[PDB]
Symmetry: D2
Subunit: 295 residues, 4 copies
């Protein structure tokens, strides 16, 4: 037998950093969870109990904290690129660093209509994420995402004209609830290395803001024919607004809200145009996925 | 042996209601999880397999949907009181209804600076809750709460002058991070029945808003001597602002953010005044509780 | 305003202890999560920012590890009593210690039919718990429990003869699935102090074993008229088997498994006697509670 | 813009099936969660709002229940193969069916040392899983796994001789705790279709039992040089025992148990040979991955 693939490192590394403006007294906080997994000439750690080739996961943890101390942690695409570049440059026998970052929301509080200098609220479980693959000889592959963006619209969703056969019970509808948890990923053009990433730094926050704005406006404004048709329009618009993105991927649950027939009770009318009270379904759920790229 | 206490019913009943203004086309959505547990002359269902005294949990579920269809679901204090009153009035042998409601946030989207008529975002897992105990002959006991309000301040928290003995390692600090998940409960004056609850309906949204605004402002502005001292200021302000509340309870985790000594690495200075990078601690956590009443 | 009630301390303290028999080389492991909340003359920490009365939660954490080092961690009733007694005895102004322990399962592996000296498996998220309230002048109040015991029987459950009115849709059944997550608590006679707890130490493991064995056997053998009737039989048997218990409490969800009518598809028969395929329901769930004492 | 990739279907489909032996009265239960995602000529559902190409996710849900009614649900490799084959055969324009199954443990209860005919316990959150990719023209690709197998050994784990540089603080150890959640996957030789899967049916349960037995014995018996070296020996042994497997993948967290230095307290000795009480770490964790194949 032989090692066909191996990666190892530290997962679930919680990191906080504060920036303090001494003149203005304004503080800014960043919180993330970091995973770094390394590849390279490490097969003998598995086959021959040779630990000499292991950079200890505990050392990888220390390096994440040291990197946060000595570099900007924003945007996460940059921090991930710096972190991954460190491991392949520092260690000759390490050839790849896979960096996953989840960013947690700390939104500045407004108190009496004025932004507070050092108080923050977690205003959603929505995350901004990166996957940064730094591969020696092959540059830096970045996937940026937002996830856990939970939305609902109470009308202007439809689902009719789907295939009907002996497996089909679902009634066509011209007015239903649509609710999802938005998982949207944009894949960047391959970067040659850390210098190229640094040259595009302003595009990271700008493309995240674009992806979020397009997601929310399209969801709110689309008279939706299907999750499929709505998510495609989001992906189209994002591609049109950032030439350095090669693909946009959506993964969207259809979080079903079922009508409740109450006509068995005193002829209560709670379906179609009279539908007021619904049963949100925890499971099952539709799961709809698309990767959109350029002609 | 004998039944000293019994209650039974349906838990985790997910409910959605929509209001449609056909005039303005503005829709408003409400989503909640409901628990109803009944007490009364039900001992014989346990002792003698006498099901005649059981209002089926399935029927309690149906009753929750029917009540939502025929009544306002807001404020939850009112909806809980109506639901509880229904069971003790409908069924001679049912003497108490315990109604627990978790209200889920559906905040109207702003699209291009304008509130959207029928699109909503879950802005955080913060909940508004009620516990409504409807007890035949003894009226209606309401506890209102907000929970899962997650906040952090980067400075203006201190902890010094605490007891020091052979069990103490904690360093006194004059400048630390304070972060918590706010659980705040206000206990209402006993209400004689549904009529008295109805007569105070506007005070429920008002007092929730007050509790939340006092919580956020006190957290942001208090140069905190301790979790204990800060939470007491929140409770005393809420009591002073609503005479119909008897007590305010706070349950606050101290979600620790530890300094990381990096001086072992190239003399890096990341402690005291130089503290930038911290390790958020998942566990353990301080847990600090107070019930405040009128002196 | 004034403090009506206060308690504070450390929650989510994860503890592991190993016992090593150097003679046999057999090792035994114990893993628990501990919460300690103190009450006493602490009002001034809330009202006057007087930290002198605070035993730091960090110090309570240290005390938990020190107590584990210097005492048996089993049975948890004993460990809880020692820990609670420590705080009210060590500190003149501390008058109550509330100790909550969750015991995690580490079951010794059998390898090739022989128990392994130092390898363990988590055989299920079932927990053994204690709540130990040590109150100066009022002794030691212990509640013992098992929780997260998940069971299902495929037949020999019934539910018929329940109240039927205009809110009822549920069909009577003479043959259904019954599945639950067993939460069972036994309340001990008040103990005068740690000496009285020590004097009953063997009864703690014995009564836990009895409660679990009665639960499993009654569930498997009762041709169940209802959750109510079955849970009462468990409680009365446990009371009859341990005179030092005053009450037995059960809290049991009814985790519904719905029949699926497939007759719309090729006349497929999957209801009543033909029921093979079911839809397990995540929510809602029946919730059935009983406290049983001596008549 | 254009669709580069698309799949859609129903996720989180909870399924129960009972087998009843009428002669012996013995019942056997199977519980799973099923996900089916379809690919094919569906791009126009995204680009042109053409629902005519959609087999409704609700219809996919119905088909999962119907398939369970008309076929064996065990082994899951067979059920997944039948389910996936159905969708590509039934619908001309559907070219791939991706079937993910999680199997939940329902272990027969022993009552008074005799297996009960119809009572079951969830004896762990351990899962047995399959991923079945049925691709028209390209056959059936099966990955089988066990996951959530939580184990600990209190000694006979070591970690020394790893790389030491200016990032390294971790002390070499010749005796530590090792605990993990085992995620082990075996990848089958490509199958030409459902007939070939049916011809290997007995190998599925046998290879799962082998993978589990090898995992537990190797973990218990290996005097471990590293997670890397131990997981490699597991993968080797499994490959040696089933020629129809091409690869074995392990993904193993290192769930750290930290020594607690108590020497600051009355010279208490709780490190190295005196280490009895440990702090289990929730995060971070080592994450170690290997895919092992044949020379
Ligand atoms: O938007 C939808 N897409 C689907 O594919 C689907 N299937 N059922 N309902 C659905 N809704
Ligand atoms: O055992 C049961 N008890 C109940 O009270 C009930 N109500 N619906 N179904 C039920 N099953
Ligand atoms: O605010 C705090 N209160 C406490 O009681 C405490 N104990 N340790 N740290 C603490 N911080
Ligand atoms: O088994 C281990 N493997 C590793 O790679 C490692 N790193 N720190 N500790 C470790 N333990
Ligand atoms: Ar950070
Ligand atoms: Ar959508
Ligand atoms: Ar609602
Ligand atoms: Ar606070
Ligand atoms: Ar322990
Ligand atoms: Ar039961
Ligand atoms: Ar099943
Ligand atoms: Ar291992
Ligand atoms: Na390198
Ligand atoms: Na009544
Ligand atoms: Na005392
Ligand atoms: Na096909």
């Amino acid at each position: 037998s032989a090692v066909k693939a191996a990666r190892y490192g530290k997962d679930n590394v919680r990191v906080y950093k504060v920036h303090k403006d001494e003149k203005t007294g304004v503080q800014t906080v960043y919180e993330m969870t970091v995973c770094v997994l390394l590849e390279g000439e490490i097969e003998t750690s598995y086959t021959k109990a040779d630990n000499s080739v292991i950079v200890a996961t505990d050392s990888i943890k220390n390096t994440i904290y040291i990197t946060a101390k000595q570099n900007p942690v924003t945007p996460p695409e940059l921090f991930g690129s710096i972190l991954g570049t460190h491991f392949i440059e520092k260690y000759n026998h390490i050839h790849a660093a896979h960096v996953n970052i989840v960013c947690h929301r700390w939104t500045r509080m407004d108190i009496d209509g004025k932004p507070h200098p050092h108080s923050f609220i977690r205003d959603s479980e929505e995350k901004r994420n990166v996957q940064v693959d730094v591969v020696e000889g092959k540059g830096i592959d970045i996937k940026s995402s937002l996830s856990g963006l939970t939305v609902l619209k109470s009308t202007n969703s439809q689902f009719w004209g789907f295939l009907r056969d002996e497996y089909t019970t679902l009634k066509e509808t011209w007015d239903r609830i649509l609710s999802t948890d938005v998982d949207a990923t944009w894949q960047w053009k391959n970067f040659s290395g850390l210098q190229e990433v640094r040259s595009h730094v302003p595009k990271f926050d700008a493309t995240w803001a674009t992806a979020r704005e397009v997601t929310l406006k399209t969801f709110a404004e689309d008279n939706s024919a299907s999750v499929q048709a709505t998510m495609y329009k989001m992906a189209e618009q994002i591609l049109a607004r950032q030439q350095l993105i090669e693909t946009v991927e959506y993964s969207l649950p259809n979080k079903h809200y079922f009508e409740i027939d109450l006509s068995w009770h005193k002829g209560l009318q709670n379906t179609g145009k009279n539908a007021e009270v619904f049963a949100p379904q925890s499971d099952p759920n539709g799961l709809i996925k698309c990767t959109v790229g350029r002609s």
